[PDB]
Design a protein around this ligand. Sequence first.
Ligand SMILES: O=C(O)CSc1ncnc2cc(-c3cc4ccccc4s3)sc12
Length: 292
Amino acid sequence: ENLYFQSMENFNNFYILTSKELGRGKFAVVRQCISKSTGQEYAAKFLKKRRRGQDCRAEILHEIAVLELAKSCPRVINLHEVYENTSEIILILEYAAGGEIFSLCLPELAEMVSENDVIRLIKQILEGVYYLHQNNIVHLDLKPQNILLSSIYPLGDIKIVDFGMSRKIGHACELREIMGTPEYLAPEILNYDPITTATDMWNIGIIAYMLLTHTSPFVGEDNQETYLNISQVNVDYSEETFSSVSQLATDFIQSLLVKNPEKRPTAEICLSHSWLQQWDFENLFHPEETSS
Ligand SMILES: O=C(O)CSc1ncnc2cc(-c3cc4ccccc4s3)sc12
């Protein structure tokens, strides 16, 4: 195999890895790096070209092609550079210093996140997913671990990451598809129904539910119970779980967590939801009744 991307010798001339390991999966590791020339921080993602006995360089090229298309969208993590060695393709990504939005979904941080914050983060996620869907990209892995923040103190802006599972509308629900984290899989995936933009909208429903309740809508004692919860759309909307959650947020979640993907609103329709309509109080409102 000949290498396509910039050499490893150039990587090590231009960047130094730091002792901050950001992430590790079976066939990928993310490590913080610093430009030796500017001191700017980046995330270096090391993708193995050989996985499960399969040559994956074509799939990695398709993933880079999707990041490259979304680089005008500030809700999507930006790709800076690409390097390659014998076993890895290395993505130099924008560093999202706040880490995962998942942290905001733990009971511990609940008291540090307002309704205002949750409304803004969901609006920013919808802006990203709107942009992807207008370009016929379905992300298909929008778990809260795949939405990052530019900062937590104070609360910054969202960055969608990890286009490993992304496809076009109408692609087959193959073996890769049906191997997400069980609790985050849409009902149409459990039924090997075809890929829809509606699958991402299901996941935005889950993210809102988790930010607002600090609980998982679908997870059970075991995968069997998780799969029953999803396939039956068995969701806890109890007075105890929702005592401090507004009706408008409940409406937003309930419009997305529906079994039939065709009944879920689009990203565009979600951006017009009454829950997300808020006036910045520091701006001067111009009413319908003019002074003239
Ligand atoms: O998985 C991927 O496809 C890319 S992951 C990634 N990309 C860009 N910037 C950051 C910052 C991270 C952070 C993770 C983490 C964990 C603890 C404290 C701070 C942080 S900041 S992960 C990441």
